[PDB]
Paper text:
Afamin is a human plasma glycoprotein and a member of the albumin gene family that has been reported to be a multifunctional transporter of hydrophobic molecules such as vitamin E and a potential binding partner for Wnt signalling proteins. The structural similarity of afamin to hSA suggests that afamin might also be able to transport cargo in the bloodstream. The availability of four independent afamin structure models from two different crystal forms provides insight into the flexibility and dynamics of the molecule, which point towards a significant conformational adaptability when binding to hydrophobic molecules, metal chelates or proteins with hydrophobic acylation such as Wnt, supporting the potential function of afamin as a promiscuous transport molecule in human plasma.
Tissue-specific transport by afamin could greatly enhance the resolution of MRI imaging in blood-flow studies. As no crystal structure of albumin with a contrast agent is yet available, we selected gadoteridol (Gd-DO3A), which is used in medical applications as an MRI contrast agent and in crystallography as a lanthanide phasing compound. We were able to identify likely Gd-binding sites in a similar orthorhombic, low-resolution electron-density map of afamin by co-crystallization with Gd-DO3A. An even more dramatic cell contraction dominated by a further 6 Å contraction in a compared with the isomorphous ortho­rhombic dehydrated crystals and an almost 13% decrease from the monoclinic cell volume occurs in the orthorhombic afamin–Gd-DO3A complex crystals. Whether this decrease in cell volume is mediated by the single Gd-DO3A molecule located at a crystal contact or is a result of shifting local charge distributions owing to the lower crystallization pH of 5.5 versus 6.5 for native afamin remains unknown. After a few rounds of rebuilding it became clear that large parts of the protein had become severely disordered in the Gd-DO3A co-crystals, and owing to streaking and discontinuity in many parts of the map the model could not be completed. Subsequent occupancy refinement indicated Gd occupancies of between 0.9 and 0.7. The protrusions in the large density blobs and difference density suggested additional features around the Gd atom, but we were unable to determine and refine the orientation of the DO3A ‘crown’ around the Gd-DO3A. Our proposition of Gd-DO3A being present in afamin is based on a preponderance of evidence in the form of plausibility arguments, augmenting the reasonable evidence for strong Gd difference density. The validation report for the Gd model states an automatically extracted resolution limit of 2.69 Å.
Numbering used by the authors: 13 to 118, 138 to 169, 187 to 305, 309 to 504, 521 to 546
Write the structure that this text describes.
């Protein structure tokens, strides 16, 4: 099983866990833990029933980190060690910092200097971009920076909206990626992936391999009863196989080109029967029939539909009103697609930099409490969405998926943030409707500024500071 892999890479698996949780730590300190864990494992191979060996492999990791001589004082995390094992795991999670400018620029030494610079990335990923980093003659950064962004974006969602929206996300994700799948199958594969994100986000490295491998087992076991593009991925070795399936393209779709949720007369009953399944089923069926849409849109629609029935199943002749839920989608969808086209012309009528400067002003205008480097970063992640996939088929399926990531960054990953009462309302309200929430924000009315007085980053920093300074002015002035 995977159980072998975890013991084989224990050196790495410990390094990552530590490095992420405590980014401020040295490599000297990493070796100290590595030995304790290695020796600990051998004692668990020296006795099957040893009291320390009935313990879970992360609440061992964090107990040693805390036990380690004056380490919590030297990296300000003593308050995490003064908590019960569960509260301590959550604390250690809150301890992980995303804005890592306080560190210097730049296997075991690499995994240290990645993990502590990329703390929220999943273990499977890092270990894959070690095997997929073991080169011979002198790129890959592109892949890692992307895989962090979606993992942070979900572990964001999980924190703020609990363990319900993450399901809906991964129904829309997997149903769109694997249309040939069946509901009862996929819904199980989701309550695996959802239960995986519980441990991967919290930072439980060891589980994030177990539950990740369990998920890839769950796919490959129904290989040609799910997909036909990941055939050579299931022949790859842990955890390449993990990131192979994830990195692959969406399945070719069946011969079927639905209206049970609209046409039927007992929709309220099937909704009242078991809501979250009924909705889960609606997101399943609508997703697999729309592989040219965004993940945020496939939730916006499901939410809108949940709102439609909520207003419908409380009136004489229910169906009459939810008859054209189908048409109400093709409306709100085509509006959103055309709205992407309106900003993909602003791109042509400015270019990378020209648009970059537009957003930075805007992004700062609405959220000027943020850091200049924080606001700068988003401005490049935002323009990356338009850089690629904003002049081709499914240009909406991307720019929406990709722009949504930059608001998760803004709203924070592992903290309930206080930016301004409006940006806060866009973050801590609804996951689906945060992009349109942000799109509808004017200048931060309530803001009291402080004093002030590469080249591309330098330019941006200047603009963001210039905007923060002259915040009482308008978009066209500052340009
Ligand atoms: C990080 O840890 C250090 C050491 O525990 C903290 O420094 C102490 O601060 C308290 C009150 O702020 C004083 O009573 C101690 O005398 C300080 N000791 C030393 C050696 O400085 C520091 O406050 C912690 N930083 C944060 C942000 O919590
Ligand atoms: C719509 C475009 O996204 C099409 N896209 C353009 C190339 N992308 C750029 C990007 O990610 O926007 C980088 C490589 N890409 C990354 C990935 O998806 O895993 C793999 C191939 N993808 C699979 C997919 O899209 O699901 C389709 C090709
Ligand atoms: C497919 C995997 O790559 C999973 N993926 C990992 C991160 N990706 C990296 C990248 O896309 O290059 C970006 C996210 N993605 C953007 C897009 O696909 O255009 C939307 C959400 N997807 C849904 C899906 O398309 O399966 C799940 C997240
Ligand atoms: C009637 C429409 O407004 C339905 N609406 C469509 C999109 N909205 C736009 C908006 O908020 O007017 C944003 C989503 N919305 C945010 C919010 O309302 O705070 C959460 C869900 N709401 C719940 C409600 O408030 O009835 C219904 C969704
Ligand atoms: C953030 O708020 C949500 C809901 O209000 C809550 O579930 C979550 O635990 C909070 N996270 C914190 C305080 O870190
Ligand atoms: C929604 O729009 C798509 C794309 O043009 C179209 O193929 C589909 O038939 C439309 N659906 C409805 C119900 O009008
Ligand atoms: Gd002991
Ligand atoms: Gd993706
Ligand atoms: Gd792609």
């Amino acid at each position: 099983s995977t159980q072998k892999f975890i013991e084989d890479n224990i050196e790495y698996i410990t390094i990552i866990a530590f490095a992420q949780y405590v980014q401020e730590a040295t490599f000297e300190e990493m070796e100290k833990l590595v030995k304790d864990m290695v020796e600990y494992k051998d004692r668990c191979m020296a006795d099957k029933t040893l009291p320390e060996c009935s313990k879970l492999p992360n609440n061992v990791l964090q107990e040693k980190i805390c036990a380690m001589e004056g380490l919590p004082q030297k990296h300000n995390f003593s308050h995490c060690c003064s908590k019960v094992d569960a509260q301590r795991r959550l604390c250690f999670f809150y301890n992980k910092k995303s804005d890592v400018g306080f560190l210097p620029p730049f296997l075991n030494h690499f995994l240290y200097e990645v993990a502590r610079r990329n703390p929220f990335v999943f273990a499977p990923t890092l270990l894959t971009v070690a095997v997929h980093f073991e080169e011979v003659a002198k790129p890959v950064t592109q892949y890692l920076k992307a895989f962090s962004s979606y993992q942070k974006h979900v572990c964001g969602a999980l924190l703020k909206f609990g363990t319900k929206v993450v399901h809906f996300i991964y129904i829309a994700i997997l149903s769109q990626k694997f249309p040939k799948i069946e509901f009862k199958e996929l819904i199980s594969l989701v309550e695996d992936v959802s239960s995986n994100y519980d441990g991967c986000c919290e930072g439980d490295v060891v589980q994030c391999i177990r539950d990740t491998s369990k998920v890839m087992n769950h796919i490959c076991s129904k290989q040609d009863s799910i997909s036909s593009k990941i055939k050579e991925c299931c022949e790859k070795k842990i955890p390449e196989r993990g990131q192979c399936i994830i990195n692959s393209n969406k399945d070719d779709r069946p011969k079927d080109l639905e209206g049970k949720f609209t046409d039927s007369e007992n929709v309220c009953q099937e909704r009242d029967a078991d809501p979250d399944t009924f909705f889960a089923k609606f997101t399943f069926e609508y997703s697999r029939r729309h592989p040219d849409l965004s993940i945020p849109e496939l939730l916006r629609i499901v939410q809108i539909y949940k709102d439609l029935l909520r207003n419908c199943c409380n009136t004489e002749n229910p169906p009459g009103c939810y008859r054209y839920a189908e048409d109400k989608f093709n409306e709100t969808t085509e509006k959103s697609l055309k709205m992407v086209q309106q900003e993909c012309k602003h791109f042509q009528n400015l270019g990378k930099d020209g648009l970059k400067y537009h957003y930075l002003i805007r992004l700062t205008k609405i959220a000027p409490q943020l850091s200049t480097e924080e606001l700068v970063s988003l401005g490049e992640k935002m323009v990356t969405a338009f850089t690629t996939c904003c002049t081709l088929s499914e240009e909406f399926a991307c720019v929406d998926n990709l722009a949504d990531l930059v608001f998760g960054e803004l709203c924070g990953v592992n903290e309930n943030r206080t930016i301004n009462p409006a940006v806060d309302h866009c973050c801590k309200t609804n996951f689906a409707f945060r992009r349109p929430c942000f799109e509808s924000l004017k200048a931060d009315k309530t803001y009291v500024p402080p004093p002030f007085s590469e080249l591309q980053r330098k330019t941006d920093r200047f603009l963001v500071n210039l905007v923060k300074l002259k915040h009482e002015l308008t978009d066209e002035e500052l340009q």
